[PDB]
Amino acid sequence: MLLPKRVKYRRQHRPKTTGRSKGGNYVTFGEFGLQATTTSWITSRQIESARIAMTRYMKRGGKVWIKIFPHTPYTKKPLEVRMGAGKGAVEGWIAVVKPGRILFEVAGVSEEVAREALRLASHKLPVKTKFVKREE
Amino acid sequence: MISKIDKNKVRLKRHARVRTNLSGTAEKPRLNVYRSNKHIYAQIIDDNKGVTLAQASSKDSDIATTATKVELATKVGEAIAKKAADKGIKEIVFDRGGYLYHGRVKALAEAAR
Amino acid sequence: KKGVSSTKNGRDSESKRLGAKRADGQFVTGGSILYRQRGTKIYPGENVGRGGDDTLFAKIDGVVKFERKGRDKKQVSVYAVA
Amino acid sequence: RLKEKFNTEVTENLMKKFNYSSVMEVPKIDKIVVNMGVGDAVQNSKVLDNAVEELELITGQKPLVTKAKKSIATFRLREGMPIGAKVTLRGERMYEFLDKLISVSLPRVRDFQGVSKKAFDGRGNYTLGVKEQLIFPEIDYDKVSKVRGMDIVIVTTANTDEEAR
Amino acid sequence: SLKSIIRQGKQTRSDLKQLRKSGKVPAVVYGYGTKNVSVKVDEVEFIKVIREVGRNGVIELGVGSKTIKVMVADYQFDPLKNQITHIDFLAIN
Amino acid sequence: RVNVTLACTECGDRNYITTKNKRNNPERIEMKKYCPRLNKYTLHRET
RNA sequence: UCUGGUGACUAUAGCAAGGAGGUCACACCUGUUCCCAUGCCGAACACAGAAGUUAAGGUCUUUAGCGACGAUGGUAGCCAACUUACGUUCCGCUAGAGUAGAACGUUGCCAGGC
RNA sequence: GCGGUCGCCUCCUAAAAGGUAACGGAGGCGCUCAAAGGUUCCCUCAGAAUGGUUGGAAAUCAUUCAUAGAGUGUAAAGGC
């Protein structure tokens, strides 16, 4: 649950989802990057239900480096009521990804682990992924 | 040792803020004086294209002298370039212009004015 | 069906119709309005004047000219030409 | 005396202590900002107003804390009088060598400052002492902070014989 | 590295994406003696840049005349394909 | 603040109407104003 | 034609280092005797005088490291248009920002001792 | 139905002229001031640390890094 602390406004607009990526199209903190190939809203809960799990495969082995942080906090109403008497209280945090962006970064550990670990991790996210080998 | 201030800087800097309403049109050309360390100046100016319309000088040396506030300061306070020019607007960046550069503002208040 | 928790919002004010009111290069009358805005976005230039901290108006007839002043500040002007 | 004692020893050293190009890159004494303080917001501050009539030349201005964090901040009290040495009083209660009328903490440090603005504090009852402790034997804070004519401590140091500390 | 390109054509309609599957890339030399007089290169002779320079050094050009050492500097890598578009050189003077 | 009223004795007419605090200055104030039928700034009594 | 003075240019005009000269002219330089005056000290604000000097400023000449202007080749975006169901794709126009190679240590206006 | 709102001012939505809706998302006003008004002078912001009864990391005037990141009687934007 990667969330912030101090926010000026608590109710915001749904982010725009069209077009290619902007920044973070490469990998730094480790040899190996997991790219993204479609568009969606990753929603902090995926991240910590696809981080603890990747480390439970990693058995507290090597180290990871996350390349996605949810900023715009999405809101939602509780029980199904009438339409329109205000906005629902914030209940989530979302991050938007576009095709061509490295989401995770790791170092040192063997490529067998890299493949058989990011395949474990992608099985939680609603975006379709593809391996990247730091292919200079 | 610490930063000492130049003063030509703020002298022309103030000439700026003072040069936002007054400007010689030659129908009323302002005369505008570069005080110096020992001497004083003046010049009539027209302000349509920045050419130099009229001119005299204190330092011109029909006579030199000392005492920056001298009757030489009031002969520069009289001199003209004879034309159809009337009681000008005294450009002043120097405090108490009604008395400080009144050396210039005094003698010419009758003939140029 | 159930009395809702209402809205702590709903207030705004009437728009004022700011902006330019005469186009660059067209002929005017003495005394006409050229621009209406809060603060001096465009300074008054030649033969124009500022009213009560707004309404840059014309002072003589002629054609208007929009122009730059220093590096980043503009200005308006009127020329007597007929 | 002292104003000329800002000359009687120094014109030849301050014409030689450096070996610059012309006489005027080679400096003089840097000016002072004789300031006093208080530790009470009411009466010690309202009644620590003359000690300047004693030491400085300023009658008494009323500047307050600016930066003024949680409990520093107050308004308009005469805790810091701006008696900075301009030219006339620029030979003020500062270069009086009455800092020996204590015989403690003369040489305080190995050096003075990494910020050229030096601070020389008559902490205690070190200064203004030629006056007997009549009303000056109560709370009284000082603030002798001013720059000198030397970029670092280095050449500032081994010609500092003026105030000898 | 002896790699040769040629002067390609401007006034391009964007109908080139489809003549692009068949290999090419743009390329434009910087430096005096000539200008941004672009040159067109192909890829599967760059399937062997592996041995050519590394990344920092010399390449022949054979670009008609003024065939000297020219340095491909910038990077214009492309997402989603493992393709490439507009890699470009410069003169050494 | 409370509303006041000024009038030039010579004209004996109260046309000008200004404001004044009942704490800042409670003492009756008086200034020179241009009252009608006089063509001169006479003294006004803020009653 | 050098400097001093006025009026144009988008810091191309700069802050960051220095280099070197003179007081014709800007400067550092003497105090309150006077004009004015710091609720505060004649450093800013003034005066008569200058025996003493060129550091600095001032001017040129150097550093493209310090920052703006940043010509092409692309590319995002977009106006029509034919398709398909678009987080698109093809076809025609206008094509950016950022990134380079660069220009880069101002063009002059009109006067004074020459 | 219950509840809450009903006038005037500032911004976003509003798609680079103006105008533009919802029980859409944020704040305010029902004044105050003889001076905080007119005129002539004169001056200059923050975030920065110095080591100065005392220190409340912050009670002070300096000094220099200070580019408007300060201050505007009152909310917010446009301005200086």
Numbering used by the authors:
A (entry chain P): 1 to 136
B (entry chain R): 1 to 113
C (entry chain b): 12 to 93
D (entry chain K): 3 to 167
E (entry chain a): 3 to 95
F (entry chain T): 2 to 48
The authors write:
Aiming to identify such rearrangements and following our hypothesis, we have conducted a thorough cryo-electron microscopy (cryo-EM) structural study of Staphylococcus aureus ribosomes that were incubated for various time durations (i.e., 0, 30, and 50 min) at 37°C. Single-particle cryo-EM techniques were applied to identify ribosome flexible regions at 37°C. For that purpose, structures of the S. aureus large ribosomal subunit (SA50S) and of the whole ribosome (SA70S) were determined after incubation at physiological temperature for various time durations. The nominal resolutions of the SA50S subunit structures were 2.65, 2.48, and 2.73 Å for 0, 30, and 50 min incubation time, respectively (SA50S_0, SA50S_30, and SA50S_50), whereas those of the SA70S ribosomes were 3.11 and 2.86 Å for 30 and 50 min, respectively (SA70S_30, SA70S_50). The heterogeneous three-dimensional refinement of the particles used for the three-dimensional reconstruction revealed a differential effect of the small ribosomal subunit on the dynamics of the rearrangement of H68. In fact, while for SA70S_30, the heterogeneous three-dimensional refinement results in two identical classes with H68 in the original position, two distinct classes can be described for SA50S_30. Superposition of both 50S and 70S ribosome structures acquired after 50 min incubation time on the ribosome structures obtained directly without incubation and after 30 min incubation indicated a shift of H68 toward the L1 stalk. After 50 min incubation, both 50S and 70S show two classes with rearranged conformation of H68. These data suggest that the rearrangement happens faster when the small ribosomal subunit is missing.
